[PDB]
Amino acid sequence: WMPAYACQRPTPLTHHNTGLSEALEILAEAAGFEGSEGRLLTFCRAASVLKALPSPVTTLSQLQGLPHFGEHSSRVVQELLEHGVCEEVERVRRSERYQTMKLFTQIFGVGVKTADRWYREGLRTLDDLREQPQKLTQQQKAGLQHHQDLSTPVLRSDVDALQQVVEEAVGQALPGATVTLTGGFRRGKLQGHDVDFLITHPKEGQEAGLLPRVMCRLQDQGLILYHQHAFERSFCIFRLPQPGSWKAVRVDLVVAPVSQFPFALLGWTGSKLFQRELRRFSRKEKGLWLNSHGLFDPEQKTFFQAASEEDIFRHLGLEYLPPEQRNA
Template identity: 65%
Template sequence: MALVPPKKRRGPGRGEEAGAGGAAAPSPAPLRFPGVTIYLAERHMGRSRRAFLTGLARAKGFRVDQTYSPEVTHVVMEGNTAVESSGWLDRVLGDSGSLERPLMLNISWFTESMAQGKPVPVEGRHCLRVPLPTRSQVDPGSLPAYACQRHTPLNHHNLCFTEALETLAEAAGFEGSQGRLISFRRAASVLRALPGPITNVSQLRGLPCFGDHSSRIVQELLEHGISSEVERVKQSERYQTMKLFTQIFGVGVKTADKWYREGLRTLEDLQGQTRKLNRQQEAGIRHFEDLSSSVWRHEADAIQRVVEEAVWQVLPGASVTLTGGFRRGKLQGHDVDFLITHPVEGQEAGLIPKVMGLLESQGLVLYQHTQSNHYQDFKDLEHKVSQSTAIDAYERCFSILWLPKSPTSFHPEAGEGPKEPSRDGKAVRVDLVVAPISQFAFALLGWTGSQHFERELRRFSRAEKQMLLNSHGLYHPEKKESLPAASEEDIFTHLGLEYIAPEQRNA
């Protein structure tokens, strides 16, 4: 499902230099390494990222094939285990299993080769291995204390308990009690990582970050199927009102609390007090029905196609990566986040106003607020990296875009001005974030989430490694140096952590 009619393209056909994603890739350099043929497996990597990496490698003189063939010498995978890669290769080779098998490598070999401009020697750390059972798979009582040390899948065995604890965490946040909010979230995160369901309260003994209050909630649910405390919270007028108000685009806890104290309770109350609303909140209320409904994965993919089209028109060779919950494997969410970069540092600067102008000319933009980057304002690297663990300084745009069901009903013909979107569609929250290539790995890690996983990763960095981590970089205060990273794997390596794939970061 595309948002704009596909344009006829000239030049290379599918599977050639344009890349599988259709991006205008950097011009390929003369082939420098005839003995190396790379195949980038799309599984877990994604179409857009694969196209970006393909163009990057070809620009450095590597041969990268779009389809697997016996000539492939190096298969590069991202977020796959040796078991998954072996099964994939068996399916690809079929009855030709006697053929020489290629090297099966993780993304670290590729990123190191790109950094050096030549194929680096294959070492043990580059090879895909069957992972050893983690403590979370063997003994629930020996789970690591930090969520960034645990594999946390999207689907887990203790949903009724985690939903109850998340309700109490949310209510604590509405009351400004950050300590209780974090305590309940840590307890819920532990339950998500367990290899099986909790059936007896004795199983909670020895679990990290699991206090008496959380244990009482679980025990009550085990014995009665319901928690009286959780039900009281859910039925309270304050909780319901705060939940309603904080679902409005542009409204945080402080604003919602202020409105509640002023006696406001409903959207109708707010619509009668328009002087209390800023432009973002007005847009949030105007499109509340759409924005409070789920965005499905196929809708996120449709939005990605139109964003890519706009970005590539403005900056050929750029990459557009879907982040957030969708990158962690979710099939639905409430907004869509994209991270944009370009292999040439600095080319990405000032990109968003041009992209949003193009989308606006197509009748797609219902609201936008663009923030220019300001990380260069920081006088020193330590200041930059330690500024905040929640907010970064990248160029970004908070927007509401229109997702039509009938693309041709809104797309303007050449020479026409913007058209009003038809009623046949929905409004969707979309964030665009632009990062320079030198900081891309940190931005990708930070914008993938989950929020609790990121909080724990930064807490681990400070408490266990005495380093400062955020979406711009990793800084070692004692050595007064920044640690570079070409990939997320590099960041985990710097911290001495096992790499956790995005699909296992649902803490």
């Protein structure tokens, strides 16, 4: 009744088990902070199963036969159903380790490994990091400077304004080039913490060298507060107008040749768990190797040509899911 892979089932953005899924996702996050990628995956998958259910779980027996619910995830749900709270989840929430690792890893430029090292050095607050700035990368300095703005959600109205300024720069850099909104906003989210755009051109090869030309033009317009600088992905901080002022916003720009555009669109539309599950399914169930550039048959040694996302789902034997149902 419930398939084992997230790419085999629709997952809407809003659902009927929000509290249960949130709790499991705390444990997934905490597992990641400790480097337990396997446990993170299981808790992520179990949470996603609940998002895909058609009604609320009210009794423990409703978990029977659901994939990725074993002793541990079932106990979490059982405690939430019985008491409205799971002691393990609450212990994680208030732990100094969890709170500090969450604070540090949310900094642009800081991953689990860096945050863990700082935690082991005794560091706990953003101001702790500010007081020792020689130990920071330029990327981390920017993440810390802009951390407050970057913690504030971006609205869809903001996204539309950003897309227009990106299109202007892209049109000068390469007439005919197109800009597509991807990521969480393409899946229907009304807010987000970053904006994702995918850029291509209908004439194969014309997109070569495009991203530097786009970045130089955005920078000349005074819109780039931070970027790394040939390349095809740019992780930027943009200056976004606001009433009488402005705010910093994370924007990612990606270029792909049109032959690869369906694969890049699929990959950059997510969710992250949906894409991991889709690539796992492709390799393990179909023997095909999927990434954001293409889909490879290692037996024939050939790449599948796709003209659409629909093509890719068909080539994997999966029912098509629109972006709004990929919220795994």
